[PDB]
Amino acid sequence: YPGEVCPGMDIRNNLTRLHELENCSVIEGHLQILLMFKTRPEDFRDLSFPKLIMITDYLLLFRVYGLESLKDLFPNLTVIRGSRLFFNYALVIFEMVHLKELGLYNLMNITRGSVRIEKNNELCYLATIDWSRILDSVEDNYIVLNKDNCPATFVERCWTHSHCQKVCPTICKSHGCTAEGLCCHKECLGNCSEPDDPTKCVACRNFYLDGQCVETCPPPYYHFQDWRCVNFSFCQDLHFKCRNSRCHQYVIHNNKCIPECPSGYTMNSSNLMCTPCLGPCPKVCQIGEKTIDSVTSAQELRGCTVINGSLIINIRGAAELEANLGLIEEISGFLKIRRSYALVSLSFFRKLHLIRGETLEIGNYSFYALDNQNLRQLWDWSKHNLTITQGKLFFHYNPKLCLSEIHKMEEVSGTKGRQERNDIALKTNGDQASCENELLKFSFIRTSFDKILLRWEPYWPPDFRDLLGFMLFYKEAPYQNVTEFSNSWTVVDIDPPQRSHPGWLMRGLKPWTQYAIFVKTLVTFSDERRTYGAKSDIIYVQTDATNPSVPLDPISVSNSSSQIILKWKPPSDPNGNITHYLVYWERQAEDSELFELDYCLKGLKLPSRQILKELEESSFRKTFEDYLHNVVFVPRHRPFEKVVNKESLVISGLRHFTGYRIELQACNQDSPDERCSVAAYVSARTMPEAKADDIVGPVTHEIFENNVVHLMWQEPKEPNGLIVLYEVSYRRYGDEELHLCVSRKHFALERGCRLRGLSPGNYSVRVRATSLAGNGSWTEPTYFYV
């Protein structure tokens, strides 16, 4: 195939970059035509690239001045593979001026994607282009704000005034039709030099190789961006091209020269195979020097695990700094920190293990710490692992960083003698870091569900007055990995004891909860800042349990006339390990007032169902105290259940349409006198039986000699709850169905009914009992002659 591969590119501000497409046949990527401001129609009526045939990704046209008809630019563009769809679009047309007609009749098919054509004040032939024949995905088009011999698919499809939209036969779906309209090769598409010939194909349906069109890439020629075939060496070279240039470090995965190894797969030093590696083993990110100034300064640093450079962080400012960072384990260069104001500690570097420091900060300092105010802790060197390959240590102007911390990096990083004198400024660092930390030991602990009582050793500096007071640092410890540090650390002051241990207790605690506790002291440092403090190691306490909470959302449904299924939620407050559930249920009596209501009347409706300013005063008192001393002295039951490992339940063996009371409780204890929560109450009624209200039983009538009939029938003694009344329909030969109501009292005292003075003839008897579920069944006709 004669031409160059034409990587995707864009042209701006003039026609000068247009000349670079002269020797182009197939675009491998995407072209963008835009910013043609200093451009005229004449400068482009005399320019074309007939050699150009294929474009891989898309084309972009936006704000181009001068171009009048695009048939001139691209007389031989046939297929846009749509491999990369710009804004999920295979073609974008926006803000077009000087342009009148489309002119690209040579485009017949698009593999995938859609086209957006917007802001075309002077576009023509808007309704004369067949989109469905070209676009396999037509509903995503956005064609708005526009000026709006050959077959009609009925409007004729024409691109220009002279040549129209070529309509290959539908049999040539993707083969392409030749000049006379014959299906070309399957690898051919649109048009072909010779019909049915991969060697003479203008276009390659799936892949290209050696002037010929193939569907797949055979080895050693690997798939190349889903459009052509290449062996390993050239793909290596471009991969190695990225090695010694700015890039797309190429890799071959699935025998495809994709720029990127897929997830969990990693580069091999020998071959380009993206070998497996659990979660992408590493993530080195090149720079070699970049400062970190804010959150966004670490945007590309997300997921980086190794830095082939050095970092100079200066954050002139919470946990957001941890999520960005801490993914990194090794850094080839040095680390420099300076005046990061709001940096209390460097905890958020979780993964920091090794530092090459081969590139050395001036003074050969693999580390540089300066103007660090709030920096109180580097890392828990008792557990964290860190080592420096080489370099020196700079630690200056860090008034709130204890020297003991400094004493730990050389013993952790193996830099014991690498430094020299003044590498650490003994006086600029930890001036306000009081870390004498006289170990403090708790004397006694008493615990409860809410009130825990402490007691600790009473400690004394050489002057008892020096002690300002105690304060207890406490906060719930879900885990065991808790260190002091903008920080919550709930803490309460304690006045020094009068001179037994001081001790203290707390309130408002949550039973069955772990807490982390440590204690420090307050002493006014001497004239030489010899604070000589005392500190308690952090301790963890877990309070006991209590009565739990009610299980939540107790919901029960009558899935059957005998099945009652319950659902609920675990209690909001387990307050200890919940051993099981307490369930209590009971048949509920219905209302007895319905047993006296006579429903034959109106009422037929049926109810169904700061500090230092204090330190002045302390010093003030002793000073006055001391002065006089020098002056004065002269040296001459219910059905229940235990639901275990379940949040639902079913109760069966229940009568239909029966009211119930349901009681649910939670207990965090089973054998030894359970601590149980209070109950959750829901009322349950099953569905009624479908045969319980039907009047079952022979109907007996007694005609009296004076034309009186007495009604005797058997009601269904087990009704749906109960039967409100009996509806009776009696009809005589030639008459209509009269209606009769038999109340509960009417069937009680009359054992049926008493009908008197009936017209002579033969009647019918139909009685239906209405239970709470509703009407039952009408009785069978008891015809009687009067």
Binding site: D463, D626, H629, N630, F633, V634, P635, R636
Partner: peptide, 21 residues
Amino acid sequence: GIVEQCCTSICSLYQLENYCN
């Protein structure tokens, strides 16, 4: 003074009667 003698330094029992009659 004297405060320097006991609070800063450590006072020995000989040093105390020097302030006693």
